[PDB]
């Protein structure tokens, strides 16, 4: 079923542009071979996990610009690239004004009849 | 509960290694008292590096 | 400001101290088991 | 005379029932009412990783005794060739399904089982009838002619 | 499938027992168990049918000249409240890929 | 015993710039072998990274585990990734050489 083996065609088939395929060793890889392997043995084996008393940076990112009405915790795989605040530099700042979509989607009426009214006429 | 903790208190007195043998002429002192302020008295300042240790 | 940053210097101080006394530990635990074993093998061939 | 119908009936078990019931192909010795791993019993006991007790595995390669790997029992297992089987073992004597080793409970408890493996399977080198829990003791010996390796088992102390 | 959604409307509208529609019948043990699958015999539905009463015989259609199943069975219990239980609960099951029916008869 | 939305492919974010492979590797190591992953090289993806192993109830430990787990200051954002969306990019051909093999080798 949706389990059967891909191949790299098909690795390259589903995600989108501008990503890159890693090895970062052979090594590493090659634990990434006997993980199957050792998921049965390394688990069984030992291993723990502790921590030390000890006193004590803590970035995130909401949707900031102005105002940006709220973003599921989800919904951020679709408008992650609205999150980034990197901006005015052709096509890809038509995608990135596009995102009135997520005004459509969430936010207050207002903000939802003039997005619509927007986007209707671009 | 307060009055069950009453009871603990009691019975927690009552368990204690030979608590009522005045024998050798031992003796049990029941204190009670208040910090009087102490709402009052706390400084932010200290406060916050005392937080600065817990979360 | 002075005693949390010289504070929190000499509970770290003591924390690598805790550590290294702790591996230590760990190794003479695993040697041991070790030994047990292989006692417990020499025990099974004869 | 012979035969008076040809088919009549059977009451008998259905292949897709014990199938969907048990799969990793099906499986065979499905846990019993008692199985508890042995990490949560010794939060029962309430101990820490270092009173806790945890059931390590030794391997000695049956013609040479002179660690492959280590292996705790703490996270049942099954007992098997190689997929299927967890505890898969290159031993190309032991059956598809060899054996089991099942914590139970009666305290917890280490046991094994034989799935009745067709050549059978030693215990300190003498043999145990299939198809029957046999609890563990400590610094017990397994071994799947047909034996290539030897195993031996430890608690956590010292 | 109907059954489910028939069940619902008796129990959100608080129909409250004995006009259930179940008391269609009282006169009636035998179910009626469609859509099943073919490898099934007497022995695993009664072994499967038993859990909510005593099924005291069974008889399952079989096609006579090829001798094997034509796909269901009318069952008949000890007990009714068996069937009662057995039609509002054991409906809509899997069995082998493929969703059984039942239903009184 | 699983929500069908999850899938074997795995959105991670809130990473670092700097951030190794072979901490990835490491780390995300633990629940299975991993099928392969990407990492935003992009402008505006770089921070964000994509992990496939090589079964789905690996994934399922990892994000149990793994949920809002720890890197340097960070907590990553671990979510089951979507599928479709942009695809088409790539097609649908080349099933006819593989296709005659399997039709060749077992000949069925």
Redesign the interface.
């Known amino acids: 079923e949706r389990n059967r083996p891909l191949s790299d065609e098909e690795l390259d088939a589903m995600f989108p542009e501008g990503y890159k395929v890693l090895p970062p060793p052979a090594g590493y890889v090659p634990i990434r071979t006997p993980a199957r392997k050792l998921t049965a043995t390394p688990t069984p084996l030992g291993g723990m996990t502790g921590f030390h008393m000890q006193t004590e940076m803590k970035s995130v990112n909401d949707q900031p610009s102005g105002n940006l009405p709220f973003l599921k915790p989800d919904d951020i795989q679709y408008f992650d690239k609205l999150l980034v605040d990197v901006d005015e530099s052709e096509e890809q700042k038509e995608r990135k004004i596009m995102k009135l979509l997520l005004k459509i989607k969430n936010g207050t009426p207002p903000m939802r009849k003039a997005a619509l009214r927007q986007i209707t006429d671009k | 509960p307060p009055p069950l903790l009453v009871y603990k208190w009691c019975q927690g007195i009552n368990n204690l290694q030979d608590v009522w043998e005045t024998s050798e002429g031992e003796c049990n002192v029941m204190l009670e008292s208040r910090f009087e302020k102490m709402y009052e008295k706390i400084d932010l300042t200290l406060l916050n590096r005392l937080l600065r240790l817990i979360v | 400001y002075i005693a949390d940053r010289k504070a929190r210097e000499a509970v770290e101080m003591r924390a690598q101290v805790e550590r290294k006394m702790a591996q230590k530990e760990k190794e003479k635990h695993e040697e041991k088991l070790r030994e047990m074993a292989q006692k417990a093998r020499e025990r099974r061939a004869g | 005379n012979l035969q008076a119908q040809e088919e009549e009936r059977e009451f008998y078990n259905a292949r897709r029932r014990e199938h969907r019931q048990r799969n990793d192909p099906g499986g065979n010795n499905k846990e019993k009412e008692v199985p508890a791993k042995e990490k949560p019993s010794f939060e029962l006991s309430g101990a820490l990783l270092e009173d806790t007790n945890t059931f390590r595995g030794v391997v000695i390669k049956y013609s040479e005794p002179p660690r492959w790997r280590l292996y705790p029992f703490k996270n049942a297992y099954l007992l098997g060739r190689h997929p299927i089987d967890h505890p898969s073992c290159s031993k190309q004597h032991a059956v598809f399904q060899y054996r089991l080793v099942e914590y139970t409970r009666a305290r917890v408890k280490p046991y094994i089982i034989d799935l009745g493996s067709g050549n059978g399977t030693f215990l300190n080198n003498k043999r145990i009838e299939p198809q029957r829990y046999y609890e563990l003791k400590e610094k017990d010996v397994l071994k799947f002619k047909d034996d290539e390796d030897e195993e031996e088992e430890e608690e956590v102390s010292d | 499938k109907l059954i489910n959604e028939l069940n619902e409307r008796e129990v959100q509208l608080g129909v409250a027992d004995k006009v259930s529609w179940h008391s269609e019948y009282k006169d009636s043990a035998w179910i009626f168990l469609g859509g099943l699958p073919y490898e099934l015999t007497e022995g695993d539905i009664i072994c499967v049918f038993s859990q909510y009463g005593e099924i005291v015989n069974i008889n399952l259609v079989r096609d006579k000249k090829t001798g094997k199943s034509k796909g269901f069975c009318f069952l008949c219990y000890e007990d009714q409240r068996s069937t009662i239980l057995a039609v509002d609960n054991f409906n809509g099951i899997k069995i082998k890929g493929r969703t059984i029916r039942v239903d009184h008869v | 015993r699983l929500p069908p939305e999850v899938?074997?492919?795995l959105?991670i974010?809130?990473l670092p710039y700097k951030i190794?492979?072979?901490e990835?590797?490491?780390i995300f190591?633990k629940?299975?072998?991993?099928?392969?992953?990407?990492?935003?090289?992009?402008?505006?993806?770089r921070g964000?990274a994509?992990v496939?192993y090589?079964?789905?109830f690996?994934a399922k430990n990892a994000c149990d585990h793994l949920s809002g787990f720890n890197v340097c200051?960070?907590y990553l954002?671990v979510?089951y990734?979507?599928?479709n969306?942009?695809?088409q990019?790539?097609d649908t051909k080349?099933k006819e050489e593989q296709l005659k093999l399997l039709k060749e080798k077992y000949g069925i």
Not at chain 6, 31 to 45: A, F, K, L, M, S
């Open positions: 899938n074997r492919i959105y974010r809130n190794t492979a072979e990835m590797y490491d190591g629940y299975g072998p991993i099928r392969q992953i990407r990492v935003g090289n992009t402008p505006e993806t964000t994509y496939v090589e079964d789905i690996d200051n960070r954002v979510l990734y979507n599928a969306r942009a695809f990019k790539m080349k």
